[PDB]
Design a protein around this ligand. Structure first.
Ligand SMILES: Cc1[nH]c2ncnc(N[C@@H]3CCCC3(C)C)c2c1C
Length: 167
């Protein structure tokens, strides 16, 4: 039993809710919140911009030190950093950004990072400003993640379409 509330159950391990991931993280304080990161951990917009704003830019400060030490992530890769005031940990996961020409096949690799964590709060990878079809992202999530994932979908209209079209 965990503290996630109001989710529709899609499969044995995948749950979904129309929610602002920032407000959901602040309420649940999950062990792991997933960020929709880029390889530079530049949290300017989309989910990343919103999460970073909620940490008062502390996420960005930590991220800049990480990059200065380690260099950029790989598309499809991830790193674990602090969750600041939102979660114990933040798993920064880089899905392919279609608006940069990146291979959508890397979306499966991106979701594989979730399997290293028993329970996660997460957005749909490569959705929103990353330009992929959120319906496809949900399909890849369901077919790749085996651990317990609680998906937050900001847009109510998109949430309803994802549910109604789910196979
Ligand atoms: C402030 C905020 N909180 C969120 N929580 C979850 N998902 C979000 N965006 C999704 C990602 C992919 C599709 C979408 C509807 C843009 C958000 C945003 C913008």
């Amino acid at each position: 039993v965990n503290s996630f509330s109001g989710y529709l159950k899609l499969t044995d391990n995948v749950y979904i809710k129309n929610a602002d991931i920032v407000e959901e993280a602040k309420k649940v304080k999950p062990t792991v919140v997933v960020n929709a990161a880029n390889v530079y951990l530049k949290h300017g917009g989309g989910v990343a911009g919103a999460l970073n704003k909620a940490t008062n830019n502390a996420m960005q400060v930590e991220s800049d030190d990480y990059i200065a030490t380690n260099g950029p992530l790989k598309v499809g890769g991830s790193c674990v950093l602090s969750g600041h005031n939102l979660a114990k940990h933040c798993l920064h996961v880089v899905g392919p950004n279609v608006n940069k020409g990146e291979d959508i096949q890397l979306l499966k690799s991106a979701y594989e990072n979730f399997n290293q964590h028993e329970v996660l709060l997460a957005p749909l990878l490569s959705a929103g400003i990353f330009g992929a079809d959120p319906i496809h992202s949900l399909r890849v999530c369901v077919d790749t993640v085996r651990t317990n994932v609680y998906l937050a979908v900001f847009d109510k209209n998109l949430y309803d379409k994802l549910v109604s079209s789910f196979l």
